[PDB]
Design an enzyme around this catalytic site. Structure first.
Site, PDB file in Angstrom:
ATOM      1  N   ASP A 182      44.990  36.395  -0.590  1.00  0.00           N
ATOM      2  CA  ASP A 182      43.644  36.944  -1.404  1.00  0.00           C
ATOM      3  C   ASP A 182      42.823  35.722  -1.504  1.00  0.00           C
ATOM      4  O   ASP A 182      43.138  34.795  -2.260  1.00  0.00           O
ATOM      5  CB  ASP A 182      44.240  37.463  -2.851  1.00  0.00           C
ATOM      6  CG  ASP A 182      44.943  38.811  -2.957  1.00  0.00           C
ATOM      7  OD1 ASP A 182      45.543  39.308  -2.142  1.00  0.00           O
ATOM      8  OD2 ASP A 182      45.094  39.235  -4.016  1.00  0.00           O
TER       9      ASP A 182
ATOM     10  N   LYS B 295      38.779  43.049  -3.547  1.00  0.00           N
ATOM     11  CA  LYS B 295      39.481  42.755  -4.573  1.00  0.00           C
ATOM     12  C   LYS B 295      38.429  42.531  -5.812  1.00  0.00           C
ATOM     13  O   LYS B 295      37.448  41.748  -5.316  1.00  0.00           O
ATOM     14  CB  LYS B 295      40.609  41.738  -4.563  1.00  0.00           C
ATOM     15  CG  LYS B 295      41.171  41.329  -5.887  1.00  0.00           C
ATOM     16  CD  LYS B 295      42.520  40.451  -5.598  1.00  0.00           C
ATOM     17  CE  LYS B 295      42.945  39.771  -6.990  1.00  0.00           C
ATOM     18  NZ  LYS B 295      44.255  38.828  -6.357  1.00  0.00           N
TER      19      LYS B 295
ATOM     20  N   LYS C 242      41.444  46.815  -4.185  1.00  0.00           N
ATOM     21  CA  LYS C 242      42.320  46.054  -5.071  1.00  0.00           C
ATOM     22  C   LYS C 242      41.646  45.939  -6.730  1.00  0.00           C
ATOM     23  O   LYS C 242      40.910  45.032  -6.708  1.00  0.00           O
ATOM     24  CB  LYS C 242      43.134  44.928  -4.821  1.00  0.00           C
ATOM     25  CG  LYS C 242      44.195  44.399  -5.750  1.00  0.00           C
ATOM     26  CD  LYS C 242      44.983  43.307  -5.098  1.00  0.00           C
ATOM     27  CE  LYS C 242      45.555  42.269  -6.058  1.00  0.00           C
ATOM     28  NZ  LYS C 242      46.337  41.219  -5.486  1.00  0.00           N
TER      29      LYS C 242
END
Lengths: 217, 217
Positions: A92, A156, A185
């Site tokens: 990430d 995300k 996400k």
């Protein structure tokens, strides 16, 4: 949605600067108990997490250039490739927010692209944290388009370290922009089971959660 | 202390995740106008800052492993040496707070030693950010002593991203611990000329400041 399948949405997350080895181990125990998708930690803890999770279906994953996203691209890549080699199954990264806000889309792109190439070369997946808190809604859309153009697998919402995290309307905006072509996400501020289900309904296919125990019990 | 003299204490600092190129340029303009000691940025902006400060006495400097201190040591090192080769003259690292708090001094030491050895090989200097906000008073002392043993050149109070920044009593504790053998940098939340002068009287030999313009005018 049973607690077991809710858990498979969850990257169980512990990223505080002062987390000790015991703290990190407790995060791993919790992830194994509830069978979450992942344990998400800063890169230093990847070898430890990998050992803790060995023999289970829970994946170690690492944030990189986190949480400010203003690390040199070369260094985000070194951190990412090291983390994967040491056990990380997903990365990430944090977007270069400053370049996004200054309208340097090509530099934003080049940054994500380099990570995407490095992570994909190793057969893993890349999530890009947009940090919605710091973006206009047009910027959220643009950040999604650039993440896709660069080959990212997920977008995300948040690092957890800004002024706010996942918002239902942002998650929906992100899902509309990337369609089914990238995962979405939702992360940051997800405290209850109802909030978690709201995020899934709003379009999230994965969640970053640190209050996981409270949610799944 | 003349405004000229005070300026040489200051690493003029802009580390926000949403700092644009224009934001960073303005920081460079301000530093050049008042002839500060440095401009301190996240590693991505080092080539740009180096270019902006070219032909002046203001040093580009980079934070690394910042602000959480939880990057793998090897990745902190790469970010630091890479930044130096792009023009960084000093490196402000964040120590591994989690291993510090967990009492794994061997690992805290090795982490700082890695950076100190690499930064010194290039002939530059290393400051270690303790993040006092997250520490007991004993941990501040131990962190200063591990920093000294590792070969660090400065101990620094704060990242600017935690719950509090430089405090007079902390600065005094640090100076007492390292004597005159290391510099002490007060950083975070320094908003007035009076506060800046108090930090100096408390023992700071350098300061991290974002409100540099207000303070010097």
């Amino acid at each position: 949605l049973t607690t077991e399948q809710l858990a498979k949405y969850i990257d169980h997350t512990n990223l505080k600067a002062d987390a000790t080895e015991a703290d990190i181990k407790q995060t791993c125990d919790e992830a194994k108990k509830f069978n979450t998708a992942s344990v998400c930690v800063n890169s230093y803890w990847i070898p430890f997490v990998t050992e803790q999770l060995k023999g289970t279906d829970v994946n170690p994953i690492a944030v990189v250039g986190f949480p400010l996203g203003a690390m040199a691209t070369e260094s985000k890549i070194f951190e990412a490739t090291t983390a994967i080699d040491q056990g990380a199954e997903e990365i990430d990264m944090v977007l270069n927010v400053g370049e996004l806000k200054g309208g340097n889309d090509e530099k934003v792109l080049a940054d994500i692209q380099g990570l995407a190439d490095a992570v994909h070369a190793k057969g893993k997946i890349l999530k890009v944290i947009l940090e919605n808190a710091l973006l206009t809604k047009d910027e959220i859309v643009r950040a999604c388009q650039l993440s896709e153009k660069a080959g990212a697998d997920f977008v995300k919402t948040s690092t957890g370290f800004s002024t706010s995290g996942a918002k239902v309307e942002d998650v929906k905006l992100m899902r509309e922009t990337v369609g089914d072509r990238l995962g979405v996400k939702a992360s940051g501020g997800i405290h209850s089971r109802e909030e978690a289900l709201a995020m899934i309904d709003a379009g999230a296919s994965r969640m970053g959660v640190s209050a996981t125990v409270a949610i799944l019990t």
